[PDB]
Design a binder for this molecule. Structure first.
Ligand code: NI
Ligand code: NI
Ligand code: NI
Length: 300
């Protein structure tokens, strides 16, 4: 066994771990540690991640799960896959402790900043018995580098859109930490006190964002936003600063590249003497151990 801490407190994990289910988050953790073989179920959203796509050789061996936080597609299917470990994103605290009552261990997470993402990867690295230290150091190195390029640069007024064109992120939202590290002053902070929530369109027009990002799982395309008549007076629409976020799970090892991506779109002048592709290339090589042929489709 190992003792690790999560959302609920100290959990003891009996080693070694054989069968894991990933729910709601952390879908790229098995790519970074090469543990696809121990994974027996995962939220269906994961199949769309391009790093999952490139490192998971036999996708249909793995059962697709809900993806909805939480409650839907739960208890009996769990017992059917017989996992010794369930890694899950705490949507509902009571929906999760009720489940933990059934004989198998849960590592439960509710990460809200990229530093919390890194801590929670390290948690899971202890249970999977891998050394994450070099991979985490690369993550942090990437954040140091962004922060350095944006030192003294004025933050751009912006926002992200989610399931619909008036759903945005505010306080206690991983998406909001990622935008912040990409040099965005997210007006969502001013209207949403937890997570992601709607606001009236009138407010979006009043805040008049200079740039707008779109959650990689949203059904919206940039075109859907640019041609919305309700948005015609917004700087970001006039100037075509509407960007869809890459196919990268926010809760996991590529969260620093999402900030880099946002920093690049928002503050191009801060990165003009910078070899972006060298940085992206070394990130994928260190974090996921891809060789040169494998990295190319991940280059920007
Ligand atoms: Ni989610
Ligand atoms: Ni196939
Ligand atoms: Ni730590």
């Amino acid at each position: 066994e190992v003792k690790v801490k999560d959302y609920f407190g100290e959990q003891t994990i009996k080693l070694p771990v054989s069968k894991i289910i990933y729910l709601g988050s952390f879908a790229e953790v098995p790519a970074m540690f090469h543990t696809w073989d121990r994974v027996v179920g995962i939220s269906d959203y994961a199949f769309k991640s391009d790093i999952v796509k490139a490192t998971l050789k036999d996708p249909e061996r793995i059962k697709p799960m809900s993806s909805d936080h939480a409650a839907a597609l739960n208890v009996e299917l769990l017992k059917k896959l017989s996992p010794d470990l369930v890694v899950t994103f705490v949507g509902n605290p009571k929906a999760v402790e009720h489940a933990k009552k059934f004989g198998i261990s849960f590592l439960s997470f509710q990460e809200k900043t990229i530093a919390e993402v890194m801590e929670d990867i390290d948690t899971q690295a202890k249970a999977l018995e891998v050394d994450a230290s070099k991979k985490l150091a690369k993550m942090q190195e990437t954040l140091d580098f962004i922060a350095e390029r944006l030192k003294g640069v004025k933050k751009k007024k912006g926002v992200e859109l989610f399931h619909k064109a008036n759903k945005i992120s505010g306080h206690q939202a991983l998406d909001s930490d990622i935008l912040e590290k990409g040099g965005i002053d997210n007006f969502g902070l001013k209207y949403v006190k937890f997570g992601r929530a709607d606001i009236s369109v009138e407010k979006i027009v009043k805040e008049n964002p200079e740039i707008i990002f779109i959650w990689w799982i949203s059904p919206l395309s940039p075109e859907d936003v640019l041609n919305n008549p309700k948005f015609a007076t917004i700087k970001a629409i006039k100037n075509k600063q509407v960007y869809k976020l890459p196919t990268m799970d926010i809760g996991g090892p590529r969260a620093p590249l999402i900030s880099l991506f946002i920093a690049l779109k928002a503050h191009p002048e801060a990165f003009k003497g910078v070899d972006i592709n060298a940085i992206v290339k070394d990130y994928y090589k260190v974090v996921f151990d891809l060789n040169d042929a494998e990295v190319e489709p991940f280059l920007w």
